[PDB]
Amino acid sequence: QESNAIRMIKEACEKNRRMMTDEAFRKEVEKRLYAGPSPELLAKLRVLWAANKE
Amino acid sequence: VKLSSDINLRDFGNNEYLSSVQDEAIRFATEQTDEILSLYSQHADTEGGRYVCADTFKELFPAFENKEDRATVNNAIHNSAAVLSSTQFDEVLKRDEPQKKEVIFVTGIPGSGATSTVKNMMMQDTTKLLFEGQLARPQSAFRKIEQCLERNLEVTIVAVSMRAERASDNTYKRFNEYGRGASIGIMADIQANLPDGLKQIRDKFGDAVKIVGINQDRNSEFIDKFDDVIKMLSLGSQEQILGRLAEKIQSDFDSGKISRECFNQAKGSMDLESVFAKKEYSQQRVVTNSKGVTLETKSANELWSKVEQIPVTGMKAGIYLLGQAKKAETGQTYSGEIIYKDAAAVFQKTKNGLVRHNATHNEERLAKLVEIGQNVSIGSLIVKSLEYSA
């Protein structure tokens, strides 16, 4: 019978179909993809970059 | 925790900016490996460091902070990000977690929505690691797959696919919202060679690696058998796809669908003139008359059918075989009526027969300087009207 990863992938395909007929759902997935670093992460990165300048 | 390998340098040439960004990225990745992996694991959107992708690691580099720089610095920071991914990949593998037995590799042409597919996967309790990256050149992936199978982990490779043209449209939107798109060179390289890479994985490791596919042109249809995955992914040669992509991004720019910035990042380091010159017109002709020009193509059995009619006034009756046009030699001047024009070529009727000019000459655009039906001289870029009334 089918492994777990293969179910996960099939479930992922169903959600990809949902994106095509639900503008609000697509927009929350695409907002997450392109969000970039959170302000919390960005604060941590700044310290990291600044402490290790040449 | 050190990098799992030395980061390979690319050659940036006389571009001092990218050359120095490269060395800064390599220095950062090599000396701060520990703090970088820790930020990626604990603080980025990575499922606790189990979603491993070079494109997520790019967001931890100073050169990538500002949206408007990402297209320019991408190639310069890539290898540093990819080696950071391998290092991360190895750190996840070393964690003792007998419950977690499954490793998923996800790949696809940029703009195919592979990343969006990964975000729509929900982590299961048996999921050890999720890696997203190119498998067209699979050598690097061999080292990762080997390590999975040494640890008795089950490996699944998921190939996400879409026609280049529609994927290209998605890359434009990503460039405009996020600052990174994709070059036509990498898009064509990937879509042409991906089957070969997946072939090389099946032949090194066998049934031990499950290989599946997602066809995004058939509403994300899941494809289960390897032979069927190879079928779906057969979408042309590298020359064919590159040729089609070059025509698309040029037409898209010429008509005003994409800005110059979006066009330049899609161009990448491609000489478009050299792509356009490789285009073939052997089964094609142009029929001119008093109403306009009609582009026709021949089938295998010698039947002509219409592709495109363009209305134009003032041309006489004519039939021109486009594949028999003489290439324009550089430095010489050619005079006469333009009889056909597209994204790749401009065809001109001279006294010594039909001539073909590349639609681009040394990054200057010839095709926009002339109209079909117009009598001109073309030389070198000097274009003159020869139109008169007497």
Author numbering:
A (entry chain A): 7 to 60
B (entry chain B): 2 to 381, 386 to 395
Structure paper excerpt:
To this end, we first determined the crystal structure of the catalytically inactive ngε_1/ngζ_1(K115A) selenomethionine substituted protein complex at 2.4 Å resolution using single anomalous dispersion experiments. We found four heterodimeric ngε_1/ngζ_1(K115A) TA complex molecules located in the asymmetric unit, a complex arrangement which we also observed in solution. In fact, not only the quaternary structure is set apart from known zeta toxins, but also the tertiary structure and mode of inhibition is very different to other zeta toxins. Strikingly ngε_1 binds as an extended polypeptide stretch onto the molecular surface of ngζ_1 and does not fold into a globular domain. Furthermore, the C-terminal part of the first helix, the second helix and the connecting loop region of ngε_1 cover the potential ATP binding site. In addition, also the tertiary structure of ngζ_1 is different to known zeta toxins, as it consists of two domains. Although our initial analysis of the primary sequence did not identify these homologues, a structural alignment revealed that two sequence blocks were shuffled by swapping position within the polypeptide chain. Yet, two loop regions were topologically rewired in ngζ_1 when compared with other zeta toxins leading to a similar tertiary structure albeit these two blocks occur at different position within the amino acid sequence. Nevertheless, residues that have previously been shown to be important for enzyme catalysis are found to be structurally conserved in ngζ_1. Finally, the C-terminal domain has the fold of an oligonucleotide/oligosaccharide binding domain (OB-domain) and consists of a five-stranded Greek-key β-barrel that is in an open distorted conformation capped by a short α-helix.
